[PDB]
Amino acid sequence: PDATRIGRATGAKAPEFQELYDFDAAALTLTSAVFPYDSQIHRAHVVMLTEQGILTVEESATILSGLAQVDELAATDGSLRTYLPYEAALKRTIGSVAGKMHIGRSRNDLANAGKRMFLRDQLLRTIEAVIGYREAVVHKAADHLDTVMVVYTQRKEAQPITLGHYLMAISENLAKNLDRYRELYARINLCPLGAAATAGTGWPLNRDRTSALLGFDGLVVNSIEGVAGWDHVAEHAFVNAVFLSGLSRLASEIQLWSTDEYQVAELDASFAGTSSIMPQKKNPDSLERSRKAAFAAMGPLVGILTSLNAIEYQYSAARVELEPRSIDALIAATHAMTGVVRTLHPNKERMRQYAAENYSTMTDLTDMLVRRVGIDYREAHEIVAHVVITAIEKGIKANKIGLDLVQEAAVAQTGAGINVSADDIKDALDPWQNVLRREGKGMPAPMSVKASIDDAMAELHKDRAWLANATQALANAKQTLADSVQQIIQTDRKYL
Amino acid sequence: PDATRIGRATGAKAPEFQELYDFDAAALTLTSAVFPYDSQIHRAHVVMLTEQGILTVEESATILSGLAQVDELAATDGSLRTYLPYEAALKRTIGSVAGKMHIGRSRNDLANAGKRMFLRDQLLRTIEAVIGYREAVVHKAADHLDTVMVVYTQRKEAQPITLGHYLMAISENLAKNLDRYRELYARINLCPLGAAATAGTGWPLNRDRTSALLGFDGLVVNSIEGVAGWDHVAEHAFVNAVFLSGLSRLASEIQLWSTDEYQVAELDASFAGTSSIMPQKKNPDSLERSRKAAFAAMGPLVGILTSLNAIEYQYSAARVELEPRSIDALIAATHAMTGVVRTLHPNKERMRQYAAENYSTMTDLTDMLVRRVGIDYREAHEIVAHVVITAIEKGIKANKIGLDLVQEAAVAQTGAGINVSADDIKDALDPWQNVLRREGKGMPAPMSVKASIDDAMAELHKDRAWLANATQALANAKQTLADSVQQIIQTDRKYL
Amino acid sequence: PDATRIGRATGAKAPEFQELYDFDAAALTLTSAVFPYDSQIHRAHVVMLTEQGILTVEESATILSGLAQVDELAATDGSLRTYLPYEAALKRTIGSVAGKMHIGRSRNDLANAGKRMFLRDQLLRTIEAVIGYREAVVHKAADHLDTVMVVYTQRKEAQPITLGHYLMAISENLAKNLDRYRELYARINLCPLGAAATAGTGWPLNRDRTSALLGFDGLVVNSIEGVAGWDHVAEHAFVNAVFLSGLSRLASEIQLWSTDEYQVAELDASFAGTSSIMPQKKNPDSLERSRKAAFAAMGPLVGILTSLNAIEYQYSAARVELEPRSIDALIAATHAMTGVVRTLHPNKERMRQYAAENYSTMTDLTDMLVRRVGIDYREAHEIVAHVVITAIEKGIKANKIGLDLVQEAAVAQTGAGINVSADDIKDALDPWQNVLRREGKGMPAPMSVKASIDDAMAELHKDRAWLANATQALANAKQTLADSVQQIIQTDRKYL
Amino acid sequence: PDATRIGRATGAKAPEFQELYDFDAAALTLTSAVFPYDSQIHRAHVVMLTEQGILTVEESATILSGLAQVDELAATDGSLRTYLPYEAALKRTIGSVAGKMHIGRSRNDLANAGKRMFLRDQLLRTIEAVIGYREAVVHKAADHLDTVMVVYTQRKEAQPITLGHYLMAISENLAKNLDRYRELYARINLCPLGAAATAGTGWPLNRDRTSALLGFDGLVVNSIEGVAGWDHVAEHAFVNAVFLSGLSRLASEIQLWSTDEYQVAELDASFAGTSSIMPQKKNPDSLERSRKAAFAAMGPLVGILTSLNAIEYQYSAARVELEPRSIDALIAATHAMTGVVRTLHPNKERMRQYAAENYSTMTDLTDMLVRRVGIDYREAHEIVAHVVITAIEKGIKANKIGLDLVQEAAVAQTGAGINVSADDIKDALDPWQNVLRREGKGMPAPMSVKASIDDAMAELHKDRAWLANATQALANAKQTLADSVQQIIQTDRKYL
């Protein structure tokens, strides 16, 4: 445990919590993050040129062996991570044949392809983390089917639910965001190589080959769109922003739960900090830095769209990027909230107490009057509203409101009495009966939530299966490319 | 023609152009736009309550007849277009039974459903307009397979293409945006009714029935998500923003084409204005107001996401909306650019002249040296760069560069001569040969572009078919609801 | 009271509250808002032309009388509120001499001047409302110098303060925002007339005269800057956004205070609503619609800056505007929060109770150990942190922590005892003594806050004086212009 | 010259150009940028505690000597750059007395003060760079009083001006932005130390002393505002964004000037790049990366304001920061555009040619008809518009339009002839006479622009004087603090 773990900040920070403090100093520049993908593009482009007869196997093998050498130099020399200095280092290593690797190619389609491969890997990384986020949310829900508590609207107690019911709302939010990310992946995972500067080339390239060797699923067909297309960058920034906004809302929800006044939940010690001056603080540092990441995600979205609004439909060096440190912040926040949800400690007795005492059961009292004594809904509302006004005025908790108070309210509001028993009123005000009566689809009754959990468990299986399939497709292509490179270098070494 | 049609502003404004001036004063408030959908929800909810036995057929028919009456009052009384004043007008019309239409319902899920139905209709309206935009772009492309012109990168002449090739880049951009809109529609077209305040209800509703009567394809299952879910609003705002950013880039592209210095295109008179003080102006008012709409679309996107980042995962009156005047601006801009593209007049001779004279053919000269005399690509680049530096210095247009100038550049740069003929150089510098040599996938050669046009023509057929299917589904549901309402009112009038 | 005033929504909405519901349907378009200022510019320009000898007094009087006539037509004919249709209506009224009012002028500098005059009036309107906001905040503070309560950091109870101390934080925030608005006014209140299209004119205008007649304090000198300058629009949008963000933070603060769990404040009935289904709701509709206005203000700021980033330094029809409905939303939110602050009802007993019982007094216990028994600050912190951990574990409220609990914590943490009396501990934990001990500058002790109130009362006097001076300058100029117009029309009628 | 300097990319990149490529990899984290200011705060706080008698001179000297030691450790150990790990390293060095440096202090007011000192230094750095930007713009203008060229509106040639006239528009823009930065500095340069956690302290601090030792000009008085105030961060982000938007507009303007079609300006070789595939490219890489920086500046502004809209008026770890790499991007872009403006090469002959031939002189022809033959302004406009329509139709350049063409247009449009000479028409169409006739305030006539240059030269002197004064105030305080530290350490070493 480091020096911030003093007083009530007991134990060490959870590693998910620690990520929130580390990502910024640890993030790569976009140039350094994309550089390893430029190397892969060089090999796939050279292999494709070799299959097309633009390069001989001897030329190809000289280039490919040199790529490995310059790749090793650039591991410690950042100046070799942009195209032309890299090419010049390659030319100093293997000679003038290094220049031939740029046949039919530009920096424009090379940079668009490399950025796509970077965002592609970061997209699967994101999808993996959001799946783990949803897993923690669903698995937590399954343990709280009977954890009765109030739900809020406008930050006011509304009606009784369960913690499991609340968490499945988050699960449905995450399922739709996973669809957004998967829909985006289909547009990110297209290869623009072969567009060259913006208009293709007279060299007889095989664009499908280059695309396949790099794991892309299809082509960015039109060559202008290949170098000028940037909407997938804006879309990636947007889904990041809207997903994180839902994460901010849950962090904010848990933060209010764990205020000194609510006290219906408490953060795990490993996800809280304290003050150096106020020893009583158990601070939601994990929650607030997670929200901060969500707020910061607005930045790339606006910058990218602003740059697109400011140019023509051309290749342009003025377009704003989605940078590694932005995605790194998202992953840190997602992991932190995963651990926050997993380790959250609800005060079940305080939750039930608020539900039973603070008048969220009044809707069921109103519905009972309408459904049992058959008064108009507005008139039942006016009676129960008077009940609450009086109960508050006299200090009577909701689970102490009885037949007398209801009748005086009726008489006070309608002149007439009311035709109900004390048992009917008691069952209307029982908060657990409130939950059980709400047994429709998507409602908090345990059997309803359990059905939602069964559906989410099945959908999570599809989520992991999609991620596994997309990951293996990239791994298989990366292996085919590596095999092709060895075949060319070894064959030239031994038989040519 | 109005009073702005003076001097070079001849004829009347195209009606698509005129839309850009009218939408703001003509736009409805969100309340007035959503109100007709609240009326439909009332009927569908009441019908569902009747099928469930919560309302008798007599109660149902009294309510339904009263809804038509209050609907007629609210046509001229805006104060009756929010829920509770509407309900009070209904209660003054048919009596206290009006209160029963709110059984098992809240304003929270009513407003979420109504806003969805509004955005749903506006989404099909948007998809229709974007289809018409893509239609004008593809059909224009088919008439310019041989309209040779330069493409630009970084606002500098790059290589020769055709106008048809350029327009098919826009078509590919629009196809992906149509996917974004259709993906969004699947999330917008879910029914949150039955969530009531946030936690469902003990009343035995049939949520699938209410959803079907209103044309929704599925449910927003979880009841918290039903009233708290707002990501589809942010997503709708985003796709609007990213689509319009592509529209801004094309408007900007056409604006540079039609500058007094480029002069490669001229706006149709019906899409241009003029100055009251400078009589020589033919101003791109249509283009700049279209870009203005794209810039303004950033606003709702940021406001909506900011409001989501600022709350808990609850129903909240603090969430920012996507308003009718924002969508109205998008439609006006899309229609205007549809007409701009349809009626655009390119100066084909000036386009060819720039391609032939301003050195965009230098890549093919460089590729010819590498591919024919077999020099290293960097060395060919240095020779052709010297050719251009000299040609500019001496005032020699690209289509006048001959064998001499190329050899002196070679000698000046390599000491050695060069092993090419004047015919090889002439064919390298022929701009139409530049286009023909680029015959790969997505490249400007007429046969390549024609293939892209064939594909887009087929995809446009799928686009219109999707829109027709989604539209008819809503029309059929609206008719079923209307039939159900008449059955209840007429049966009660005659047989009960 | 309208139909939303049911149940606990007693009485009628405060008119400041009602503004939040009315501004959107009542807002003018920018064109209709700026039109009356275009009329004033016409008169000031014509008068200036008359002084310069460009117009005769007879020509001037014919034009001026015609301006009044067309002004009356345009009161009901919106088509006459853009320049050229207005001019054509003027020409149909008085003849071809109407064309002479545009000598040396363009629509470009006319629109820039008119928008400035609109924003100028709306800026004084804003400054007036923010002054009233600060007045309500300071005057409320003066009545709560002894209203002890906790302040929060990270939504956790921190240390004891007073409500008056909290409100003076808001006052200091508002004082700096008033400086932002006044600094902006100096840049808004410059006249760009005389720039004509963008490059001035050969006509011998007197720009100082036109500026003075319209109440401007100086010129936008350079003629390009006159028509192309737009930063004051972006700046106006920004100050709106940052001011409202502070208003959102106070609304959010009051919303947490008035949660069912805090219960340290209650909104006045005239600033709260209720639910149609949940009769127990007293909802912070005023607070959440005020925050919504703050979130929406992000929109114009981004749209305006995006449009500026997208063009050249020219006049351009693509620039995004600050529209009346945006400023209207700000004024409604400012008025609402003015009334919210004025009528807010704090529960003083609950406030004191939290301060005394929920451990915000622990800092003073820690400071007492360091200052009295002379232990290292970290060691005192570790002892008091143990006190809190134990007190929470045993259910002991802070104002029940005594000598025993402190000594056992010392022994548990240092092995040694502690050299303090029960009276020292009791005074360290007295929350009102916590407040009194913090008597430095800007601290919550009543004498400190009272000094801050004395300073703010004096500054508010300067605020109102600045507003009065700027307002009277505009009123005097508007009268001089009106007198000049009558002099020209009457003199021509009677003596020429 | 590096490996990107090939072909037409001759010589080495200007160092201002090179900054655009280096700042991102070279930028510090906010933590590492603020750390040296935390060290200064420690010393100033300890000195203040010593003057107040809270620390003895021996305690003070032990702490101060230890601060230098830990400062040296943290130069290579980034883990020691947050408060509590730093304090723990101090405690391991000098013992438990290290804990006393936090008396009456929190991390909350320490971080607010340190961030202010960072932004304060970066603000003077920004003001210095913007002054150098304005210097290059004014000094360039002084050399082009007679460089006749057209000005554009809506990207169309408008009227003749001079390059000097255009640049003075930029100067007036920069003067107002310098006012924004100086107004901000007054709010940034306030000391929040003494606020402690949020509510001050019972320790008898002297806040004015701490403020003075750190160079602040005043206090953030209220203690809540001291830790919760964040508007100066948002304001700093905004002025950055609006200033850069003006820089983007000039970069965009110069980019269009230097298109292959305009050809009225050419970037200096040291500020241009080229393509690896297209040898004819001279690319505006400096301009587009400068615009990219302007677009990216939208990000921090939105993120900061979003975070403020999302919290209460408290200290909060969720607030978004203005980070060093954002300010670094601004400085790189400002320096680059400074060098771009200084070294820009206008083609004066092409500029004059466009002015003389492409009809920007038509306003003066129209004004001449009104002022000389006394026709109505609309009728003159219709005649000159017909002149242009015919001149374009027949290929007649503006400086070849003579008496015949004007008369036929008159006859074609009014039936009547026109009463002007060929000499009157020739002088109306002389572009240099157009400039000379516009001799009012802020107009392009050389004598007018020269007056504007005289005013700017005087204002630039005030700008540098303000910067010098604010800089020396900080330098003097930093020296007083250093002297105080030596006095305490040396006195304790030798006499105590």
State the maximum Cα–Cα separation within chain A, in Å, rounded to a whole number.
107
Chain D partners (3+ C-beta pairs within 8 A): A, B, C
Distance CA D55, CA B343 (A): 82
β-partners of residue C161 are C149
Q: How far is CA B275 from CA A206, C163, D153, in A?
A: 52, 60, 10
Distance CA B277, CA C194 (A): 13
Distance CA C33, CA C78 (A): 11
Give first-to-last CA distance, chain B, whole Å.
Answer: 61
| Residue type for position A53 | G
Contact B441 A194 (CB under 8 A): yes
Residue in D300, D487, B287, D138 with CA at minimum distance from that of residue C302: D300
Q: Chain D residue closest to C439 (CA)?
A: D202
Residue A138 near residue A121, CB atoms below 8 Å: no
The backbone torsions φ and ψ at residue C357, rounded to the nearest 5 degrees and listed phi first, read -110, -25
| C-beta atoms surrounding B353 within 10 Å | 17
Q: What is the CATH number of the domain that holds B429?
A: 1.10.40.30
Q: Domain range holding A432? A: 351-437
Distance CA C198, CA D151 (A): 8
- The residues near C203 (Cβ < 8 Å, ≥ 6 apart) are C54, C103, C104, D367, D371
Coil, strand or helix at A397:
coil
User: Which DSSP helix (H) or strand (E) runs through B346?
Assistant: strand B345-346
Distance CA C30, CA C34 (A): 6
Residue in D243, D265, D455, D226 with CA at minimum distance from that of residue D350: D265
Which residue reads 């839902």 in tokens?
A: A246
As a dihedral over the C-alpha atoms of residue D84, residue D85, residue D86, residue D90, rounded to 10 degrees, the angle is 100
Chain-centre distance of CA C123, in angstroms? 10
Supply the DSSP symbol for A100: G
Chain-centre distance of CA B335, in angstroms? 9
Contact D303 A298 (CB under 8 A): yes
Residue C228 near residue C209, CB atoms below 8 Å: no
Q: What is the DSSP string of B399-415?
A: GG--HHHHHHHHHHHHS
Q: Can you read off the two tokens belonging to residue B182? A: 């259709």
| Residue type for position D194 | G
Resolution of the experimental structure, in angstroms = 2.2
| Residue type for position B422 | A
| Residue type for position A380 | A
Q: Where are the alpha helices (DSSP H) in B297-417?
A: 298-308, 324-343, 348-357, 362-368, 377-394, 403-414
Question: Is C134 labelled a binding residue?
Answer: no
A235-264: buried (b, 16+ CB within 10 Å) or exposed (e) per residue? Answer: bbbbbbbbbbbbbbbbbbbbbbbbbbbbeb
Residue in D232, D201, D204, D228 with CA at minimum distance from that of residue D216: D232
Q: Cβ-count burial of C304 within 10 angstroms (0-12 exposed, 13-18 middle, 19+ buried)?
A: buried
In terms of DSSP bridges, do strands C218-219 and C190-191 run parallel, antiparallel, or are they unpaired? parallel
Chain B partners within 8 Å of A97 (Cβ): 376
Chain-centre distance of CA D381, in angstroms? 41
β-partners of residue C148 are C162
β-partners of residue B191 are B219
Coil, strand or helix at B191:
strand
Q: What is the DSSP string of B203-257?
A: S---HHHHHHHTT-SEE--SHHHHHH--HHHHHHHHHHHHHHHHHHHHHHHHHHH
Distance CA D101, CA D62 (A): 11
B388-418: buried (b, 16+ CB within 10 Å) or exposed (e) per residue? Answer: bbbbbeeebebbebeeebbbebbeebeeeeb
Breaks (C-N over 2.5 A) in chain C follow: none
Chain C partners within 8 Å of A275 (Cβ): 153, 158
Question: Is C100 labelled a binding residue?
Answer: no
In terms of DSSP bridges, do strands D265-266 and D345-346 run parallel, antiparallel, or are they unpaired? antiparallel
Residue in D85, D98, D95, D97 with CA at minimum distance from that of residue D35: D85
- The residues near A129 (Cβ < 8 Å, ≥ 6 apart) are A330, A331, A334, A335, A338
Residue in A310, A283, A341, A327 with CA at minimum distance from that of residue A167: A341
| Residue type for position C454 | D
Residue in D235, D207, D285 with CA at minimum distance from that of residue D13: D285
Contact A256 C155 (CB under 8 A): yes
Distance CA D19, CA D30 (A): 20
The backbone torsions φ and ψ at residue C162, rounded to the nearest 5 degrees and listed phi first, read -130, 160
| Residue type for position D318 | A
Question: Is D289 labelled a binding residue?
Answer: yes
| Residue type for position A329 | A
Distance CA D381, CA D369 (A): 9
As a dihedral over the C-alpha atoms of residue A442, residue A444, residue A448, residue A450, rounded to 10 degrees, the angle is 110
- The residues near B455 (Cβ < 8 Å, ≥ 6 apart) are none
User: Which DSSP helix (H) or strand (E) runs through C495?
Assistant: helix C446-495
Q: Which of B158, B259, B387 sits opposite D278 (nearest CB)?
A: B158
Residue in B322, A291, C176 with CA at minimum distance from that of residue D310: A291
| C-beta atoms surrounding A143 within 10 Å | 11
The backbone torsions φ and ψ at residue B408, rounded to the nearest 5 degrees and listed phi first, read -60, -40
Supply the DSSP symbol for A79: G
Distance CA B220, CA B191 (A): 5
Residue D192 near residue D221, CB atoms below 8 Å: no
In terms of DSSP bridges, do strands B218-219 and B190-191 run parallel, antiparallel, or are they unpaired? parallel
Chain B partners within 8 Å of A170 (Cβ): 313
- The residues near A490 (Cβ < 8 Å, ≥ 6 apart) are none
Chain B partners within 8 Å of A302 (Cβ): 298, 302
Chain D partners within 8 Å of B281 (Cβ): 153-154, 156, 158
Q: Cβ-count burial of C395 within 10 angstroms (0-12 exposed, 13-18 middle, 19+ buried)?
A: exposed
Supply the DSSP symbol for D310: T
| C-beta atoms surrounding B3 within 10 Å | 17
Q: How far is CA A365 from CA A368, A377, A396, C138, in A?
A: 5, 11, 16, 44
Chain B partners within 8 Å of D384 (Cβ): 279-280
User: Which DSSP helix (H) or strand (E) runs through D157?
Assistant: strand D156-162
Q: Can you read off the two tokens belonging to residue C257? A: 């205070």
Distance CA A22, CA D78 (A): 11
Q: Which of B151, B202, B224 sits opposite A198 (nearest CB)?
A: B151
C420-433: buried (b, 16+ CB within 10 Å) or exposed (e) per residue? Answer: beeebbeebbbbeb
Q: Can you read off the two tokens belonging to residue B223? A: 């009841």
Give first-to-last CA distance, chain A, whole Å.
Answer: 61
Angle between helices C107-142 and C30-51 (to 10 degrees): 120
Residue in B163, B374, B344 with CA at minimum distance from that of residue B265: B344
As a dihedral over the C-alpha atoms of residue D253, residue D257, residue D260, residue D263, rounded to 10 degrees, the angle is 180
B211 to chain C nearest CA, in Å?
Answer: 21
Q: What is the CA radius of gyration of chain A?
A: 31
Distance CA B456, CA B134 (A): 9
| C-beta atoms surrounding D458 within 10 Å | 10
Q: Cβ-count burial of D404 within 10 angstroms (0-12 exposed, 13-18 middle, 19+ buried)?
A: exposed
State the maximum Cα–Cα separation within chain B, in Å, rounded to a whole number.
107
Chain B partners (3+ C-beta pairs within 8 A): A, C, D
Chain C partners (3+ C-beta pairs within 8 A): A, B, D
- The residues near D319 (Cβ < 8 Å, ≥ 6 apart) are A292, D230, D233, D304, D307, D308, D311
Contact B284 D362 (CB under 8 A): no
Distance CA D78, CA D90 (A): 15
| C-beta atoms surrounding C125 within 10 Å | 15
| Residue type for position A459 | E
Which residue reads 């230890």 in tokens?
A: D66
Residue D119 near residue D237, CB atoms below 8 Å: no
Q: How far is CA D154 from CA B267, B282, B369, C194, in A?
A: 14, 10, 43, 19
As a dihedral over the C-alpha atoms of residue B207, residue B208, residue B212, residue B216, rounded to 10 degrees, the angle is 80
β-partners of residue C431 are none
Residue C274 near residue C9, CB atoms below 8 Å: yes
Residue A82 near residue A39, CB atoms below 8 Å: no
Distance CA D217, CA D206 (A): 15
Residue B130 near residue B334, CB atoms below 8 Å: yes
Q: Which of D6, D362, D389 sits opposite B381 (nearest CB)?
A: D6
Residue A199 near residue A223, CB atoms below 8 Å: yes
State the maximum Cα–Cα separation within chain D, in Å, rounded to a whole number.
107
Residue in C174, A293, C241 with CA at minimum distance from that of residue D234: C241
Chain C partners within 8 Å of B88 (Cβ): 3
A145-163: buried (b, 16+ CB within 10 Å) or exposed (e) per residue? Answer: bebbbbbbbbbbbbbbbbb
Q: Which of B78, B196, B295 sits opposite C310 (nearest CB)?
A: B295
Distance CA A419, CA D391 (A): 94
D209 to chain B nearest CA, in Å?
Answer: 39
Distance CA B188, CA D197 (A): 46
Residue in C436, C418, C419 with CA at minimum distance from that of residue C427: C436
Residue B377 near residue B370, CB atoms below 8 Å: yes
Contact C8 A284 (CB under 8 A): no
State the maximum Cα–Cα separation within chain C, in Å, rounded to a whole number.
107
Distance CA A408, CA B36 (A): 41
Contact D312 C253 (CB under 8 A): yes
Beta strands in B9-155 (DSSP E): 148-153
Contact A276 D316 (CB under 8 A): no
Q: Which of D277, D296, D310 sits opposite A291 (nearest CB)?
A: D310
Which residue reads 């310019």 in tokens?
A: B144
